[PDB]
Scaffold this active site. Structure first.
Site, PDB file in Angstrom:
ATOM      1  N   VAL A 188      -8.640 -27.835 -47.929  1.00 45.30           N
ATOM      2  CA  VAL A 188      -8.509 -28.560 -46.590  1.00 45.30           C
ATOM      3  C   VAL A 188      -7.240 -27.571 -45.540  1.00 45.30           C
ATOM      4  CG1 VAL A 188     -11.059 -29.343 -46.871  1.00 45.30           C
ATOM      5  CG2 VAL A 188      -8.829 -30.712 -46.794  1.00 45.30           C
ATOM      6  N   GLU A 241     -14.672 -27.118 -54.067  1.00 47.35           N
ATOM      7  CA  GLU A 241     -14.654 -28.194 -54.566  1.00 47.35           C
ATOM      8  C   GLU A 241     -16.198 -28.273 -53.373  1.00 47.35           C
ATOM      9  OE1 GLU A 241     -11.031 -29.978 -54.910  1.00 47.35           O
ATOM     10  OE2 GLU A 241     -11.951 -30.604 -56.455  1.00 47.35           O
TER      11      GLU A 241
HETATM   12  C1  LIG Z   1      -0.239 -31.825 -51.678  1.00 52.16           C
HETATM   13  C2  LIG Z   1      -1.237 -32.266 -50.693  1.00 52.16           C
HETATM   14  C3  LIG Z   1      -1.434 -33.682 -50.142  1.00 52.16           C
HETATM   15  C4  LIG Z   1      -0.985 -31.593 -49.218  1.00 52.16           C
HETATM   16  O1  LIG Z   1      -1.660 -31.514 -48.237  1.00 52.16           O
HETATM   17  P1  LIG Z   1      -1.559 -30.776 -46.719  1.00 52.16           P
HETATM   18  O2  LIG Z   1      -2.428 -30.772 -46.347  1.00 52.16           O
HETATM   19  O3  LIG Z   1      -1.564 -28.833 -47.766  1.00 52.16           O
HETATM   20  O4  LIG Z   1      -0.029 -30.099 -46.282  1.00 52.16           O
HETATM   21  P2  LIG Z   1       0.584 -31.742 -45.687  1.00 52.16           P
HETATM   22  O5  LIG Z   1       1.569 -31.092 -45.394  1.00 52.16           O
HETATM   23  O6  LIG Z   1       0.121 -31.727 -43.956  1.00 52.16           O
HETATM   24  O7  LIG Z   1       0.805 -32.717 -46.147  1.00 52.16           O
HETATM   25  C5  LIG Z   1       0.289 -34.069 -45.398  1.00 52.16           C
HETATM   26  C6  LIG Z   1       1.689 -35.352 -45.907  1.00 52.16           C
HETATM   27  O8  LIG Z   1       1.974 -35.053 -47.409  1.00 52.16           O
HETATM   28  C7  LIG Z   1       3.300 -34.847 -46.512  1.00 52.16           C
HETATM   29  N1  LIG Z   1       3.813 -34.162 -47.099  1.00 52.16           N
HETATM   30  C8  LIG Z   1       3.888 -32.842 -48.431  1.00 52.16           C
HETATM   31  N2  LIG Z   1       4.999 -32.324 -48.801  1.00 52.16           N
HETATM   32  C9  LIG Z   1       6.056 -33.321 -48.379  1.00 52.16           C
HETATM   33  C10 LIG Z   1       7.187 -33.436 -48.667  1.00 52.16           C
HETATM   34  N3  LIG Z   1       7.529 -32.035 -49.537  1.00 52.16           N
HETATM   35  N4  LIG Z   1       7.865 -34.429 -48.872  1.00 52.16           N
HETATM   36  C11 LIG Z   1       7.425 -35.552 -48.564  1.00 52.16           C
HETATM   37  N5  LIG Z   1       6.052 -35.505 -47.873  1.00 52.16           N
HETATM   38  C12 LIG Z   1       5.574 -34.345 -47.627  1.00 52.16           C
HETATM   39  C13 LIG Z   1       3.258 -34.926 -45.586  1.00 52.16           C
HETATM   40  O9  LIG Z   1       4.603 -35.554 -45.017  1.00 52.16           O
HETATM   41  C14 LIG Z   1       2.264 -35.236 -44.695  1.00 52.16           C
HETATM   42  O10 LIG Z   1       2.521 -36.643 -44.685  1.00 52.16           O
HETATM   43  P3  LIG Z   1       1.261 -37.565 -44.061  1.00 52.16           P
HETATM   44  O11 LIG Z   1       0.010 -37.383 -43.809  1.00 52.16           O
HETATM   45  O12 LIG Z   1       1.970 -38.863 -43.669  1.00 52.16           O
HETATM   46  O13 LIG Z   1       1.033 -37.064 -42.417  1.00 52.16           O
HETATM   47  C15 LIG Z   1      -3.079 -31.978 -50.267  1.00 52.16           C
HETATM   48  O14 LIG Z   1      -3.048 -30.811 -50.400  1.00 52.16           O
HETATM   49  C16 LIG Z   1      -3.647 -32.702 -51.724  1.00 52.16           C
HETATM   50  O15 LIG Z   1      -3.332 -34.256 -51.696  1.00 52.16           O
HETATM   51  N6  LIG Z   1      -3.858 -32.101 -52.551  1.00 52.16           N
HETATM   52  C17 LIG Z   1      -3.855 -32.338 -54.509  1.00 52.16           C
HETATM   53  C18 LIG Z   1      -5.982 -32.491 -54.373  1.00 52.16           C
HETATM   54  C19 LIG Z   1      -5.720 -30.922 -54.847  1.00 52.16           C
HETATM   55  O16 LIG Z   1      -4.582 -30.135 -54.014  1.00 52.16           O
HETATM   56  N7  LIG Z   1      -7.374 -30.656 -54.274  1.00 52.16           N
HETATM   57  C20 LIG Z   1      -7.896 -28.922 -54.428  1.00 52.16           C
HETATM   58  C21 LIG Z   1      -9.130 -29.155 -53.071  1.00 52.16           C
HETATM   59  S1  LIG Z   1      -8.488 -30.258 -51.912  1.00 52.16           S
END
Ligand SMILES: CC(C)(COP(=O)(O)OP(=O)(O)OC[C@H]1O[C@@H](n2cnc3c(N)ncnc32)[C@H](O)[C@@H]1OP(=O)(O)O)[C@@H](O)C(=O)NCCC(=O)NCCS
Ligand SMILES: CC(C)(COP(=O)(O)OP(=O)(O)OC[C@H]1O[C@@H](n2cnc3c(N)ncnc32)[C@H](O)[C@@H]1OP(=O)(O)O)[C@@H](O)C(=O)NCCC(=O)NCCS
Ligand SMILES: [Cl-]
Ligand SMILES: [Cl-]
Ligand SMILES: [Cl-]
Ligand SMILES: [Cl-]
EC number: 2.8.3.18
Lengths: 504, 504
Positions: B269, B293
């Site tokens: 998402v 999912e």
């Molecule tokens: C990894 C994950 C957090 C990335 O989220 P994303 O939507 O792809 O991208 P974003 O850049 O918006 O990530 C969101 C947050 O992570 C933080 N972030 C991303 N990369 C970071 C890094 N290298 N260091 C610190 N913070 C980081 C962002 O700052 C952001 O913070 P915020 O919530 O305070 O604004 C997310 O994919 C996840 O939770 N993965 C685990 C579950 C999953 O993959 N399941 C399968 C289907 S969804």
């Protein structure tokens, strides 16, 4: 008794040297071989000699070598000495090859063992130019009877442009019948077939590898020996570990979390594994079943004593003594053992369905129970991940077992942070060392640390571990999985710098 | 019209406050809820107030909260505001609950989503006192029709001593029939049943959750909305990533490594996921299939256009505008979507059999392509591993996508060593950032590093990454996976100390 029973295929017999000439610089070669069993022997030797000669003349001559798992001095050893392998996968235990790998002279990637066949078919390793497979016999039908392992041989046979068969008279003719080779789609193009296995002892296929004979370019008559496991009994440390696990198994059964005959067991090789198996041999759990990668001395003895009903695996790994025993009684043991393609023995779907108990070794674990199976100091390869991930993640229970220290006490097996990770917290539920057993089911990381430190760590290292954790709890960026990044890998560097993890 | 079609159960209807009184301090409570959809709402709010009241009077009142995956403000939010949760599993996205976790006030373990039902049945979480589940309706024979997700609800119903049902008339009545619930042994005691799914569009069960009505202790009539998060409109970073990925799919097709209809697709998402779905919508590929999912806005669009033929998931995850669209056309979309138990949607056996393409986000990867999905600086939890492990390891192709930097350039998403590892090298083959795409298939760690550094890292950080790598290659304990342990985690420490990974 003639081993090549297909009359016509006998005309394809030629010397090992001439056969080796079919292998060209740059070629991708798939071979039999798994836990030092059933790998080709004579062609690789000949190839290595020609490779050295070519190098001295200024001619590039290297191959990519894809196997089932580990081989032996004749294959990994000789090709390594000749500097003849540019890429290797997925699992090596030869010291010479290990040295090439750790010097950056041979490229290596240790894929999950059960995934190798699928990745090979997908094209990850490139086009297979050659399949070089050891055979006990060739049937009147042109079927290829495998030797002491199955591994990836059926896949390599399917994929390869040309095929070289080594028919090895050293191998016991009575192996014929022991293997179960399925013609279904396990690792081919999606959608794959449902693999109909619902009991560890269930055969679904036939006794032979299949291959179009037009593809067989040479058959080489050979006479050479597999590598053997050492004849060595478990020490007091291994016995202590085995004792803790057996007590655990008992408690689980009594709590009704395990059946009285337990569940299909996956065990490894080595002192700890043998101690566990020796324990189970004289244990209170009857009618045990094996669904593992390998048949070792331990499992042989239980099949012998009747305490274990059947054992499924892809390979053998036996002491000379144990080998002598099975070869003398092959008709008995053949009714107790099923050797499967490794993409079946190591199938996560089947492992989870059967509810296997996984029991594996480790280099080290950190205080949160992340596990390193492979890379000392995070950078020096030992063997490879092998099937530990296939089994750890898919199992009903994932158990890791190890001495609490290595190198004569100068290294702690429990560290603030693993220098490399193979198995994440989610893939490890139980830890056992000679100091005790940690049961981590249902626990947060901080809860895991408390168990691992208090139950598993050596007394020489426990206070140092508790000190790290207590200070991390206080000063870590986050408190969910507390770390002190300035010192997390410092014990490892201390070993590198001083030869010990203990302060001076 | 009446949502409770079984007359006998109408007698158990009662107020939210009264139902919440059935939940006691120390209870383990399993609830419905997955990606902001179909979690209970009114009972948790009532519970939270009573907790806060008890706390003010010096009385303890906390629970263990086990869910499908993420919930919403009415559940994770309220209870965390009340400090009412002592243990939480397996996946959370609520900011207040996240704070409790990272402060050490709520213990947390993020199990693989597909495994949660199995571990619950094994007893890892203890004995379930309460199942609290949101429903669209109750059928004449007392079946429970789920709402906007299935999650783990069937398993929690089986295990819990007492059951509370919330019947939410905000949920569309025509959701009835969209769900597929199996009574087979997916996550129970071994040996498990074969799950016979051989097509993404295949149903194996029925439309209702089953529960002994004698266990139903309360039914609450509700009317309240799910957490429909705002549509994250793709930015240029996201569009560039989707562009590299789609170009890649295109090439794989032309080389016959993927069919023209690709393979069953799993995506997440947010920003990047949305950009990818929009690219597939405009793309050349026909007859697409989703096996994931979640159903998201962009998936609905392709189902409408006919670009996608079916979408399998455990849950909806839709913006307000998408929510309204499907609500007015529920009869149409009902025929195009199957909502499954999460232990089926995330079953490794099935994912692998179908040959899914996994596309997931990440916090960071190190130069060797180990992936962190969860723990910032290695210690502070974000969301959880969720189903990323389930899909990454089992997929035909495992792809990770991310901006090459975070925090406005002050953090590199590609680092010398990841602070925490969720996905080992073996579980990641393709990396995509706005800088380019790294195809890692068949490569050794050093070779992976050369691709990741050149293709994916940001120009601000590439030279630093290259300098670490060059010096490691010269000095590392072993040269198979070169590291300098003195500085491997130093960029993270630099960020903790200065607010940026770039030097001064
Ligand atoms: C990894 C994950 C957090 C990335 O989220 P994303 O939507 O792809 O991208 P974003 O850049 O918006 O990530 C969101 C947050 O992570 C933080 N972030 C991303 N990369 C970071 C890094 N290298 N260091 C610190 N913070 C980081 C962002 O700052 C952001 O913070 P915020 O919530 O305070 O604004 C997310 O994919 C996840 O939770 N993965 C685990 C579950 C999953 O993959 N399941 C399968 C289907 S969804
Ligand atoms: C982890 C593994 C290497 C340990 O092997 P083991 O024989 O059971 O354990 P041992 O105590 O005998 O130690 C083996 C070697 O690793 C070294 N070693 C073990 N722990 C170490 C540590 N924490 N630091 C440095 N070296 C270590 C030992 O020194 C020994 O090397 P040596 O021959 O030079 O003395 C082995 O289990 C393995 O290769 N695992 C990966 C494959 C696998 O698990 N497949 C699954 C089923 S077989
Ligand atoms: Cl299967
Ligand atoms: Cl658990
Ligand atoms: Cl199945
Ligand atoms: Cl690969």
């Amino acid at each position: 008794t003639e081993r090549i029973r297909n009359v016509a295929l006998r005309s394809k017999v030629c010397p090992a040297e001439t056969a080796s000439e079919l292998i060209k610089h740059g070629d991708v070669v798939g071979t039999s071989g798994f836990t030092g069993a059933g790998y080709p022997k004579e062609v690789p030797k000949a190839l290595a000699q020609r490779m050295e000669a070519a190098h001295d003349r200024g001619e590039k001559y290297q191959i990519s070598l894809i196997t089932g798992a580990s081989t032996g001095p004749q294959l990994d050893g000789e090709l390594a000495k000749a500097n003849g392998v540019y890429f290797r996968s997925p699992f090596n235990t030869d010291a010479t090859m290990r040295n090439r790998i750790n010097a950056g002279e041979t490229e290596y990637f240790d894929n999950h063992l059960g995934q190798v066949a699928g990745r090979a078919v997908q094209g990850n390793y490139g086009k297979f130019n050659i399949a070089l497979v050891e055979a006990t016999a060739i049937t009147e039908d042109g079927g290829i009877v495998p030797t002491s392992s199955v591994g990836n041989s059926q896949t390599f046979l399917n994929l390869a442009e040309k095929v070289i068969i080594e028919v090895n008279e050293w191998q016991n003719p009575m192996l014929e019948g022991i293997h179960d080779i399925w013609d279904g789609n396990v690792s081919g193009v999606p959608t794959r077939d449902i693999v109909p296995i619902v009991r560890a002892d269930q055969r679904v296929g036939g006794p032979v590898l299949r291959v179009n004979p037009d593809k067989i370019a040479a058959i080489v008559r050979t006479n050479d020996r597999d590598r053997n496991a050492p004849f060595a009994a478990p020490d007091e440390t291994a016995k202590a570990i085995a004792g803790y696990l057996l007590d655990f198994f008992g408690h689980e059964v009594k709590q009704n979390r395990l059946p009285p005959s337990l569940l299909p067991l996956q065990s490894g090789v080595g002192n700890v594994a043998n101690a566990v198996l020796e324990g189970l041999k004289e244990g209170p759990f009857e009618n045990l079943v094996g669904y593992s990668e390998v048949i070792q001395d331990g499992m042989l003895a239980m099949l012998d004593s009747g305490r274990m009903r059947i054992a499924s695996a892809s390979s053998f790994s036996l002491s000379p003594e144990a080998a002598e025993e099975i070869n003398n009684r092959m008709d008995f043991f053949r009714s107790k053992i099923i050797l499967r393609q490794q993409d079946v023995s190591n199938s996560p779907g089947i492992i989870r369905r059967l509810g296997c108990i996984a029991m594996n070794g480790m280099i080290e674990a950190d205080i949160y129970g992340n596990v390193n199976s492979t890379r000392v100091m995070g950078s020096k390869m030992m063997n490879g991940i092998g099937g530990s991930g296939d089994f750890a993640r898919s199992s009903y229970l994932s158990i890791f077992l190890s001495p609490s220290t290595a190198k004569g006490g100068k290294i702690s097996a429990i560290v603030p942070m693993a220098a490399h990770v193979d198995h994440i917290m989610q893939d490890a539920q139980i830890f056992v060392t000679e100091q005790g057993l940690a049961d981590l089911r249902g626990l947060s990381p901080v809860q895991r640390a408390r168990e691992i430190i208090s139950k598993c760590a050596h007394p020489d290292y426990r206070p140092m571990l508790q000190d790290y954790f207590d200070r991390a709890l206080k000063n870590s960026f986050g408190k969910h999985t507390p770390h002190l990044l300035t010192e997390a890998l410092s014990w490892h560097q201390r070993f590198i710098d001083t030869g010990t993890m203990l302060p001076s």
